[PDB]
Amino acid sequence: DELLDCGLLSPVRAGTPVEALVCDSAWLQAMLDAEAALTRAQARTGFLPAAAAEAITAAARADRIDLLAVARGARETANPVVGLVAALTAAVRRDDPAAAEYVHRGSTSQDVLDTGAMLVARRALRLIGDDLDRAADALAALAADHRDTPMAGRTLALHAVPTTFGLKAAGWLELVSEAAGRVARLRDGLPFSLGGAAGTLAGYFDPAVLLDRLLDAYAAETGLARPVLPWHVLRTPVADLAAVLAFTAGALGKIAVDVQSLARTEVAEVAEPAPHKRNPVLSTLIRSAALQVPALATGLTQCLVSEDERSAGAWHAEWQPLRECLRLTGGAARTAVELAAGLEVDAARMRANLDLTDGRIVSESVAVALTPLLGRQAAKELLTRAAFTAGHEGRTLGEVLGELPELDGVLPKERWEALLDPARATGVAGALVDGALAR
Amino acid sequence: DELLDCGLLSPVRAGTPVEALVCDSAWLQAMLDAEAALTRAQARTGFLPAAAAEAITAAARADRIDLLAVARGARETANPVVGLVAALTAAVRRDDPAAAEYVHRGSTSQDVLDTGAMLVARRALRLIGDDLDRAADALAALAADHRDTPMAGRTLALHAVPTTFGLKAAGWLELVSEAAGRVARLRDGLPFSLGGAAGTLAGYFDPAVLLDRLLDAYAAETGLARPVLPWHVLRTPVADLAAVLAFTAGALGKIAVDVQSLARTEVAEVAEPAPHKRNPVLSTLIRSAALQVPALATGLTQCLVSEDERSAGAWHAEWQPLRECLRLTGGAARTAVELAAGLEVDAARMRANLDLTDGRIVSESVAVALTPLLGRQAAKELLTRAAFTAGHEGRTLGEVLGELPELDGVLPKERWEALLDPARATGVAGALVDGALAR
Amino acid sequence: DELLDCGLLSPVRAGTPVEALVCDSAWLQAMLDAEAALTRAQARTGFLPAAAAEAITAAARADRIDLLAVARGARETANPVVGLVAALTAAVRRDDPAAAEYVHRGSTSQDVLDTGAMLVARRALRLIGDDLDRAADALAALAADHRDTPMAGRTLALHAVPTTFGLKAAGWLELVSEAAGRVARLRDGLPFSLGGAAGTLAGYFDPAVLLDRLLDAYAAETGLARPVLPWHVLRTPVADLAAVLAFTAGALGKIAVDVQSLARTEVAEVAEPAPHKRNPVLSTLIRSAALQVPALATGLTQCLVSEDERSAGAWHAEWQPLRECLRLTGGAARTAVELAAGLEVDAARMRANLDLTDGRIVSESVAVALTPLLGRQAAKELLTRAAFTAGHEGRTLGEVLGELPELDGVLPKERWEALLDPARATGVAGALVDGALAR
Amino acid sequence: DELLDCGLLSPVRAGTPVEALVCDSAWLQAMLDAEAALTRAQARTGFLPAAAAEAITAAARADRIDLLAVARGARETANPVVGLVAALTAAVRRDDPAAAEYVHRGSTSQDVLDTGAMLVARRALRLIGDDLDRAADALAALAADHRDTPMAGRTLALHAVPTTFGLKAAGWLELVSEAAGRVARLRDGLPFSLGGAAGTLAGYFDPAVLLDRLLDAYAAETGLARPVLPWHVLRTPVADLAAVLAFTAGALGKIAVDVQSLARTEVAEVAEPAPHKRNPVLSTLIRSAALQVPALATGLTQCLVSEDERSAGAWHAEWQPLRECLRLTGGAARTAVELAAGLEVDAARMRANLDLTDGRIVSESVAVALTPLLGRQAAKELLTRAAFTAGHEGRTLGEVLGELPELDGVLPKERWEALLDPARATGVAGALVDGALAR
Ligand SMILES: O=C(O)/C=C/C(=O)O
Ligand SMILES: O=C(O)/C=C/C(=O)O
Ligand SMILES: O=C(O)/C=C/C(=O)O
Ligand SMILES: O=C(O)/C=C/C(=O)O
Ligand SMILES: O=C(O)/C=C/C(=O)O
Ligand SMILES: O=C(O)/C=C/C(=O)O
Ligand SMILES: O=C(O)/C=C/C(=O)O
Ligand SMILES: O=C(O)/C=C/C(=O)O
Structure with a gap:
């Protein structure tokens, strides 16, 4: 019972669909996908037989693997891929002993783990962006409906000059529209990782011809982008995810503190959708993520400082904070859709507060x-x-x-x-x- | 299968004993402990009958509660305690319908959650401190054994003047001894949280007499410290945990980058305990935590900025990063014990490198x-x-x-x-x- | 005109007395103090003649040194001490050519710079603690005066149950009293740095006898603490300053967001001391520091990860953020004294708001x-x-x-x-x- | 003498050209530029007379203003613009009393300060990008020259398989080329700030016609971008600067730790351009910035959480960290140009180390x-x-x-x-x- 992660300490994402995309078994599955796509791409290139690719693909299923054993054996090499590869190799061997020889051919831990990371990120970013698009639709409707709804503009906590809730909502829309645009662009540019033991791809193999064929096939098999160079220590994709998730969480945090300012007892200009204490829980959850993701993103940005051909720690520091950022921002996006969709604007209380x-x-x-x-x-x-x-x-x-x-x-x-x-x-x-x- | 958190993305703590202390069900248990100790303390004070306290205590077991339902219902109030209380109330009601009336009497979500937080922290800090004490014993032995083992002192990556590995190990010892001392002191001063709905304890109740009796009993029932004032928005305990965990992880990070400097191919003055690539995985795991906890600690420190009588988000931002800090630092402590205990010092290679x-x-x-x-x-x-x-x-x-x-x-x-x-x-x-x- | 740092971008500390303690020339002076105290301590120990100590001391004045040249020559060695030592040596040589031979004897850059750092920190911490004590006096008076002043306790931005402004002020007092206690304790334990080129003190020199005599004299000459071991890569003092400054700024940030909650137009339960827009500028300034120091402190905490006998960068990353933390927290402390001393409590508006x-x-x-x-x-x-x-x-x-x-x-x-x-x-x-x- | 900021504590930028772009008087000048361009744009639009615009422009010179008085009066309003405006108004009044009436017409503090901020950022980004382009030229030459220079690929601090220094340098180039591309794109999109007291531009004034004319003229007069909406609390430009500066510093940090790995005594495969201790000071300086900017960037990202129409603190927390990020990254860029241009590659020592x-x-x-x-x-x-x-x-x-x-x-x-x-x-x-x- 001690292995369950239910979101007990993180209600902003508990029960939301991003949890299943980025849980441990989803990452295990993503790493199996990366392995199977590699053997498929090496088969399309001609370096191994197609029947081996078909058998490895069919065995590359989380249900065929012991997750807890893989995770606990990682202490031996500081990453789970060696244990995963051994588990996948036995699963293929049970059915097809000739195919098992081809599991993980020429490859290295980081190619599989980082490719799995980018697959999890791509799938989570698709969900995050779709929710941001839903939030933006609701915000654009609020912005149009309330174009002429007057209210007190507040600066440094005091009434300044009047404004309109429509204008305020258009600012919310601006942030959300911006974040949704970056999420979609980053999603389309996430690359696979195919580098080999130290980024020369020696194990996978005129030379420009076979490189471009293998790179073009691995992009096809994974659906991920082809990068200029192996990026085992060129951590641009991770820093980009860091940046767009922290921006997204911060933008949603902006809506959340605005709702809290407007929803408090003495103001009561808006209310969240529903003794007799209707706490603004949705904005509280969004805010809780906004106070977490930027700090996590900073740790992820620092890992750009990755020494040699593979860092002895800075790469390893990326996985858990990256998963948390995707998870918290995904929860915050889902929560923001609910907040923007059900927000109750009290136009008369806004007009009355103008007289204060x-x-x-x-x-x-x-x-x-x-x-x-x-x-x-x-x-x-x-x-x-x-x-x-x-x-x-x-x-x-x-x-x-x-x-x-x-x-x-x-x-x-x-x-x-x-x-x-x-x-x-x-x-x-x-x-x-x-x-x-x-x- | 999608609820399991096995440590797949965090090998520094996977399989280590801190995982079970700070997993979701351990927190659920800690929150039940806080509830049951409150009813026991209110019984010793005279505000409710002892048989009710005995029945609530006997029902306050994680096995009697649905963890996943509690975690997923939290979205309604932004915290799990309302759902937990309802689950505990039904469990007591099955056996003793008169006792169920007394579950959570006069209390509030934050009293139970923060008290559970401090109980988890106290139990995890006991483990962290015991491991730090084990590391310090091994380091003191290295420091004594190698008092006269000469080696190159290195400054700004170059040989400077000679030193001794004994001196270097005594510096490792100094850091670990310091961190173990602070962990034990912080552990003895973690307080319970008994404040009521807004820190006046109105629900729990000449006035100084009954306050001190209830406070003295709640300290007895929980084993936690009695604080001067309710601390729902006086987040000193959390900032202290933030500080000592980041110090601990950083100190262990210092040992880890030192081992990596000495263990690299061109130097080979030490080796971690064990093709033919014996990567320094223990120092890599310690380092991976050191690159994570300080960023997490900074988010926890910022929550000192908690507005009014309960923050609408900043308190909520504390739980997951606090659990992660305890978890990562606990893994790093366990890993550091293994590293200090099995470290192989090559005295002859040190002497030879002095000639470079x-x-x-x-x-x-x-x-x-x-x-x-x-x-x-x-x-x-x-x-x-x-x-x-x-x-x-x-x-x-x-x-x-x-x-x-x-x-x-x-x-x-x-x-x-x-x-x-x-x-x-x-x-x-x-x-x-x-x-x-x-x- | 391009060298002036007036506090243009940082009004929380502009014009406050901490600026002069921690400006560039104050650090230059502190580094000269460390040099002169070292020669004095070596003279009291017997390693050099007292007349040389007297002449070096008399020349060790910022007015005798070109600050801009020292700062700009540092790019050659990545720190200013080599340039400073050469400037001090010429100043002593002008007057006493025999004393000049003894400037910086047996010493190293980090001993002088870190000792100067701890001297600046000790002097700035004395000011910070004195202001925190002034804030606490005003807060204790607010807490006593308003013991029975009822007001709405607010949780998650909504009225919960009533409380008293006296209770709220006692929580402010608790934080400030706590921070002032840690500032004073940290101030008394800041150590000097006497380690030599790689922490063996080879250049400064039965062995235990002369070490303890030189250490006891350097503590006397500097007034700083004597540490167990040279701490060139045992960065406990810097992490401690990091922790207590971030705690202090955060605690003051708590008062600031509380004042802003109470001071807003719709609430108007307090006002800061003074068209017709009396913005809460003091709380705004305190808050601006609270949103800066924790991030700066996290960079300082990470420098505990200092490799070998002197880090090639992590030590260098400490100076500017440490100076900023002292500067911003000092400004925030001064501002908090002004805020606590002149705060206007509107007891009748509190009573009226209870009815909302x-x-x-x-x-x-x-x-x-x-x-x-x-x-x-x-x-x-x-x-x-x-x-x-x-x-x-x-x-x-x-x-x-x-x-x-x-x-x-x-x-x-x-x-x-x-x-x-x-x-x-x-x-x-x-x-x-x-x-x-x-x- | 206590106002001078010489870079004493920050040698990575001391003496580099970015210091003069982003010092206090440069910001004062930028804020005067924003004021004068506003009056010019209002004149081109027809809201004030051109002779007033010409006279205000001629007086809008840092030499006509008391910097120290402006900076120290800011404590009254928590920002320097009110004091600046009064100083500019007297300077124009000395010469042209009719023009003085038009200084700062219809405007607000944040329009001027943020517009000045974006002007400083645009000018500093031009320098940063030009240096990054110089670094990339040198790196591309290293990458071409050493395409076939074999060396040990190192993973987790140990020899893995051989690689080429040309490949490693091409990775350095990739990062620098990426950062230079983002710096130039961000530079072209930095917007002016024209919002008025609460973002309605009420003070500056069918309605769509005069808005677009004033916006198009203010873009012409400033050279900055025209934004969709006033962004007083839509802090996308600041978060973007945060992101690209932290990426840039981190990328340069990657080169720096690589050089340190290769430059150490036991390896000696490269040397930085020049007793007999040639410390790698350039990489040490670059690294010192890389350990600072990400933490500063995280504070800047959090300010996206800006409440209402102007935050009471979060906007104020932006100025100093933004200036520091520009300053440290600018120094690191200049230092990286020097490092890439003068790097000494020892091809024979690389070949020999392959045999280790x-x-x-x-x-x-x-x-x-x-x-x-x-x-x-x-x-x-x-x-x-x-x-x-x-x-x-x-x-x-x-x-x-x-x-x-x-x-x-x-x-x-x-x-x-x-x-x-x-x-x-x-x-x-x-x-x-x-x-x-x-x-
Ligand atoms: O760290 C890894 O994942 C692999 C290292 C190696 O193959 O040497
Ligand atoms: O390729 C997939 O399996 C998923 C792609 C996505 O979710 O965007
Ligand atoms: O936030 C809570 O946990 C409780 C809030 C309330 O009782 O109002
Ligand atoms: O009271 C307990 O249950 C545990 C205390 C501790 O682990 O220190
Ligand atoms: O980095 C210094 O300050 C001195 C280095 C050395 O003496 O080697
Ligand atoms: O020793 C000094 O000069 C100052 C000491 C202090 O300010 O506390
Ligand atoms: O904070 C400012 O700069 C202006 C505030 C106001 O005009 O109310
Ligand atoms: O407009 C200016 O004055 C400068 C523009 C730039 O430096 O890019």
Whole structure:
């Protein structure tokens, strides 16, 4: 019972579909896929017989392998591939003793492990990107629906000038659209790893002709990209995954702290989909991943410093944090879809909250309107003293302005009601939402 | 088959005893322990009947609970305790319907989860500290045995002056002894968490009298420390665990990169215990943890920034990285015991490597010996030109010194053989090892 | 004009006294102090003449040295000490040509640089600890004054149960008191660095007798601690500074996000000391450091992985992040003193905000009071439905309870007013503040 | 004298040209550039008179501003722009009192600061990319020259199979070419910041018409990119800089640890350009930055979590780490150019080191050659026992193979000399270098 990893300590991903893509047996399967695709590619190239490739492929199934034994024998070589290869070789030998000779021919641990890593990453990135696309669809709908829903723009925790929830949602959309675009691009460029014992491919084998044939076949068999050079110590793919997962988690973290700001008791402008404590749990889960993935990504970025032809530790430090980043970001993406899809916007509570500073939140809109008649510098100086006196006498900004002798008869009454209305001073928030949505 | 976490991606801890202390079901058990100890402490205080405490305790067993259901229901509240409490309540109800009313009385999720966290940490720290003590015993034996084993001190990757492997091992010992001392001190000071819904303990209940009685009983029932204040947002214990685990992993990482420097093909002064490639896998595993725990610790330290009376995410970000730190550091400690216990020191290869700079490595010892007869500044200037000319004419430093007219007749021949012997110029490395070992 | 570092990009420390302790010329001075104290200690031990020590000491003044030349010549050896030593040697030579021979005798770059580092750290830690003590005095006064000032405890961004600002301030005090205690302890244990070229002290020189005399004198001349072993690659002091600075910054970050939560427009329970936008700038500055020091500390912790007898890079990576940590934490400490000293608590706005959930915030206090008459499980179930119906019909919790037939005549009216008063349901917050303040 | 930042603690960038691009006065200048370009763009759009734009531009010079006063007044608002604007306004007022009214019209602190940030970043990225291009030119020459220079491939610190220094240098080239490509792309896409007080641009002003005219003019006046939306809390540009600087530093760190591995005393296959201790200082400096920038980048990535319309701290945490990343990576780039340009390759010492395992390093090449005559599985099993017996009897691998009865007469003597020659078993390293160089 002590082997089960249920997501007990990580509810942001527990029960979400990324768990099955990136669990230990999924990695074991990915490593078997890499082995079988290698023998298939070597067969298509002519270095081994097709019947051997067919038999190895048929045996390359996690169900044929003892996961716990493979994982526990890894301490002998610091990686699981030697144990895996021996287990796969016996499974093929049971059925086809001639094929077993061809398991793992000319190959090395890192080719199989890193190729499996990139296969797990490609499959997890497909899920992450599909969820990000779902989030973006919901966010674009929020952004269009609420183009004209006024609310208090908040800077450094205080009301500043009014804005629109549509504009805020378009910013959420911008981040999510950006992350989904990078996830898809990174997914299409993840490479296989075919290098041999020290990156010369000596074991797999005019020379340019057979290299390009084997590289083109291994790309076909794996579906992964063909890289310029073996990358056993050129860890660009891992640093890229590090970067796009930390960006994705951070972007989703941005939505999460925004929802928490808007969802708190004193504000109550939004609510997450549902004693009588409806805690914002979805944003809490997204945030919990955002406070984890960047630190994990930094450890992954440092592994670019990989010495010689295979690092004695820095490569080994990559596997678990890479799996965690995929897992946490995948959970956060799924959670963000749920959050964006079910978010409840309370437009009336937003309008009401605009009145909380007693007109101070429009005092830059009023300064602009008075500038033709007072001058820029004098209008600002006049609104500053009013905003302080209103924030002393407990009166509204309109009340205090209506007692300044400098202002008598300066505007028709109907125009004063229009100027003091926070719901009208939204700048060009509307034109910004359209340009965002036209893209 | 997709729930098994076997350590496939983390061989530094796979198969080591810390895995069972800190796996998901161990945390579930720790949380049940915290619940049962709370009811026992409330019974000893008088707030509930002892038979209820006895029945709750007997039901508070991981085998009575569905781990996967608890973990997957946590998405509803962002933590597993509500689901756990409901599962424990049904288990007690099957046997004793009056006791079930008392499960989780007056309590809150964070009291149970954090108390379980500190119980897991205390038990894992006991194992980590015991292994560190075993490493230190082996290191002290290496340090004593090799007090006089000369070798090249290396600075910025080049031979500098000679030293002793005993001195180097005493530095390893110093780090390990330091980490083991902090692990034991932190272990004795980990506190329970008894705060109630927002840290006032309103649900658990002249006032100073019943507080101190309940606090003293909960400390007795858990064996954990009693803290001054509820620490739901005073995350000192977690930051402390963060700090001592990152220090421990880093210290062990220091031994690991040293072994790798000494174990490489061109050096071969040590070997790890055992085609014909005996890779230093133990140091590789220790190093892999050292490249992971500090990044994880930094995420844990940032959670000190926990807003209000319970953070909406920063507390949630603590559980998985804390479990990983305990797990990776525990594996690294176990691996370090194996490395220190079986390390093979090749004293003759150390002596031979001292000769690789053709005497240049003793040219500060020779400058010291010539200073009475040449002057400090002139002896240094004279050894500099010799060390360059020897590093040009391909001759030894002794050969080049034997042609300088300034040096003719300056020392008896027997004294020249003594000065040029790298094995004698070890400074006070011997007296340093003794002082280290006297402590 | 391009050499000035004014704190333009780091307002949290600009203009604060820690800037002068840890600027480049302060480090140059600290390194000169380390040199001069070494010659003084070697003179007290008998290895050089006292007049040479007196002359070197008198020349060991930053004003006698070209800072920019020293800093720019460091690229030749990757550290400034060789250039510094040459500059100090000429300054002493101008006055006393016999003393100049004794500058830097038997020594090495790292002894001087790390000793200077620990001197800068000791002096900066004295300032940091003194400010933390000032913050703690103000916080203890806030905690005592507001022992009985009721306010809404907030968990996961929502009102939970009532608490007291006194309790919250006592938690702030707890963190600050803890950090100030560690800063002072670390300050008293910072060691000097006296190791020689590779940690054997060969250049500085029965053997145990002269070692202990030189070590005891260097401790006297520097005022720093004597360590068991040279620590050129045993980076415990740097990791300790890393840990206590990140803890300190994080603890202060906790106060800062709390103030921001309480200071926002919709809450307005506190204000920082002072158009009409009084942004919480002090908490913003403290927070900006809290989001920087932990990442810097993690880089410093990783340098525990220092290979051989002197690392070719990991030691060099320590200086700038260590200086930044001291600088940012020092600014944050000074800023926190200002924040704690001038914080404005609005007790009436706290009381008023308690009413925002229309009684829901007391529904656990009411469940406790009804338990003798309804049962624990039934009282909770009854308050849950009321809290939902009140959060639907827009009525208070008292209103909805007054229509449940189960509750008719259950309590005198006077007792209902007492139960529904949020200002009375503060648990044992009062007894917690006293215990905190008794320590 | 206490304001000078000379690079005393950071020799990797001291004296390098990036220091002047990113020092405090360069940022002050960049912020003045942003102000002046805004008034110019508002003039080209028609919102203010051109003579005012000309006068503001002429006054917008760091020499007209007190840097220290601006930096020290920032504590009042937590950023320097209010103080800067007041200083610029007086400078323009001295000459042209009508223009002074137009300084900073409709604008906000973050527009100016972030636009200045992106200007500093664009100018520093131009330098970083130009140096990376210089490094890549030198690396491509090393890669071509040494296409056929055999050397020991090293995996997990031990000889594995032979490779070529040309192949290794092509991997260095791959990383540097990749980083230089991303630096140039990021440089072309850095955006200006024009958002107004809360991202609605209310102060700067059918609506889509004037927005696009002002945005198109501000892009022209700054030379920066036009973004879809104001990005005051959409911190994609900063996270991108974070990512590409950490990648760049890490890639250069890879070259640095490789040089250190090859440059150490026992190996001596390369030397950096130049008693008799030629420490690898350039690689030490590059490495010191690689151990700093990733941690700094992680703090910068976390600031994607920026709440509301302007964060109360997370934006403020960006400036100093962003400047440090540009500064350290710029120094590392310059240092890497020097390292790649002057690197000394010792081809003969590489060939000699191939013999250190007494033929074991070719035992996979020999297994391949014997496979037609023994079988794959039996050839491997036969070379394993030989490699162990050779690593016991102290004999070469050829010697031990020449006594196995299974091998008698299996190959002509001339073919045995060819098989046992480490310089011939380089796999397809040659064809890999060409493909790398064709790109
Ligand atoms: O570390 C590995 O996976 C393989 C190393 C080797 O073959 O030498
Ligand atoms: O090739 C596969 O099996 C999966 C590819 C993907 O999920 O994108
Ligand atoms: O977050 C929890 O665990 C509990 C929150 C609450 O009771 O409000
Ligand atoms: O109390 C326990 O169950 C364990 C304590 C420990 O392992 O130290
Ligand atoms: O790195 C130093 O500071 C000194 C190195 C050496 O003396 O070899
Ligand atoms: O010894 C000094 O100069 C300063 C000591 C301190 O500031 O604590
Ligand atoms: O934080 C700033 O730079 C401006 C804030 C505001 O204008 O409210
Ligand atoms: O526009 C400038 O002033 C500089 C641009 C660049 O350096 O790339």
